[PDB]
Amino acid sequence: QSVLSQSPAILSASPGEKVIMTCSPSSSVSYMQWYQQKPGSSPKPWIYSTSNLASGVPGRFSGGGSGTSFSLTISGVEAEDAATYYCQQYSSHPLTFGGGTKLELKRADAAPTVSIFPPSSEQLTSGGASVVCFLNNFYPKDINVKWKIDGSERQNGVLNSWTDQDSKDSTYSMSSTLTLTKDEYERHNSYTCEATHKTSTSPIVKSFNR
């Protein structure tokens, strides 16, 4: 067995920085192969024979190492480098991969653009009611959303989902859905969505009143 350990797990660099990716096998390895994987796609050959760049890989990349310590160094992190890099070995058996290194872009903070959407009349017809809130294009991936129905916080029935860092501006977006029964929906008036982000001293709110 030749277990490969990659570090760090998540790596954030500003464009132009020089980044070093490490891959440690618990036992001597002849060569190390590296792959790049971008969300929604299969992995792509990056480096073979521990230092050879595959077709299509820019010169800002360089692999290296010996025995039990290999690395992948990017001299000027560009935007298109954001992806997860995998190291692979076959000096021992079976064939193993490393846990991967996710490189994410570091950028200036941006406040999200909140939008709240009352239940569509089509949904109500179907005796259900879902109030949605979109917190878009913000940078510190960390954000806090809290729903309130008439001043009383509701942590029950909320569905949240986040997107991967955007390719065009390096920001994240979030979707917060609160689902209720048409009858429970109509037993209230004010619905509020409250985002808490580093870009503001006070919470960002969006509401509508029935």
Binding site: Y31, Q33, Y35, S41, S42, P43, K44, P45, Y48, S49, A54, Y86, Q88, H93, P94, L95, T96, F97, G98, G99, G100, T113, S115, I116, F117, P118, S120, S121, E122, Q123, S126, S130, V132, F134, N136, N137, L159, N160, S161, W162, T163, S173, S175, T177, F208
Partner: protein, 217 residues
């Protein structure tokens, strides 16, 4: 030129078995070993085994010996991998990669496999028009909520693909064996009530194709 096209996403109940195919093209098929790799949702890659398309010989990762059964059909340059005794832990994305005496230089697009006891459900699509005005980010954001469907793969475009900038399709979230998904589009304020905005949803598993026009409330 070199191309390995795999079979589509599949849904099967535990205890069943499936045969995923990996069609090779653009080279001499019998001259490269075909390897099968596994990617568990959120996790890392895990190697399954290889096959000599010339003599049908296989090498395996001990952990997959009783599960995968690698075969090849030289007649059409196709490589298969059957999975027996399926369980939830078998739900992952499966790839077929070609090795070239150093590394995996060509990979198929992968095959999403879902092993579940849940039943396929057509989605319910609801348009999210702003409440009597609202939105301001780059002036007026619209939505499209795709709710209560099960076969994960669902496709959402706006104006049949024409609207492509300002779109944020949110990844699905499994709730009680039914997924929920939502997409937004931030259009120019002089663009919306005036022009037609339609969110298109396609869910092959159930054969549904919904074209949902966003009208103001």
């Amino acid at each position: 030129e070199v191309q390995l096209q795999q079979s589509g996403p599949d849904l099967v109940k535990p205890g069943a078995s499936v045969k995923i195919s990996c069609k090779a093209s653009g080279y001499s098929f019998s001259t490269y070993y075909m390897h099968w790799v596994k990617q568990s949702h959120g996790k890392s890659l895990e190697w399954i085994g290889r096959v000599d398309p010339d003599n049908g010989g296989t090498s395996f990762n001990q952990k997959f010996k009783g599960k995968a059964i690698l075969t090849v059909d030289k007649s059409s340059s196709t490589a298969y991998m059957e999975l027996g005794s399926l369980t939830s832990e078998d739900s992952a994305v499966y790839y077929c990669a070609r090795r070239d005496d150093y590394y995996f230089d060509f990979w198929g697009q992968g095959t999403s496999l879902t092993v579940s006891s849940a039943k396929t459900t057509p989605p319910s699509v609801y348009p999210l028009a702003p409440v009597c005005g609202g939105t301001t980010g780059s002036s007026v954001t619209l939505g499209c909520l795709v709710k209560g469907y099960f076969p994960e793969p669902v496709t959402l475009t706006w104006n049949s693909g024409s609207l492509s900038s300002g779109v944020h399709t949110f990844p699905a979230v499994l709730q009680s064996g039914l997924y929920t998904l939502s997409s937004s589009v931030t259009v120019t304020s002089s663009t919306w009530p005036s022009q037609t905005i339609t969110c298109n949803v396609a869910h092959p598993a159930s054969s549904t194709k919904v074209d949902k026009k966003i009208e103001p409330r």
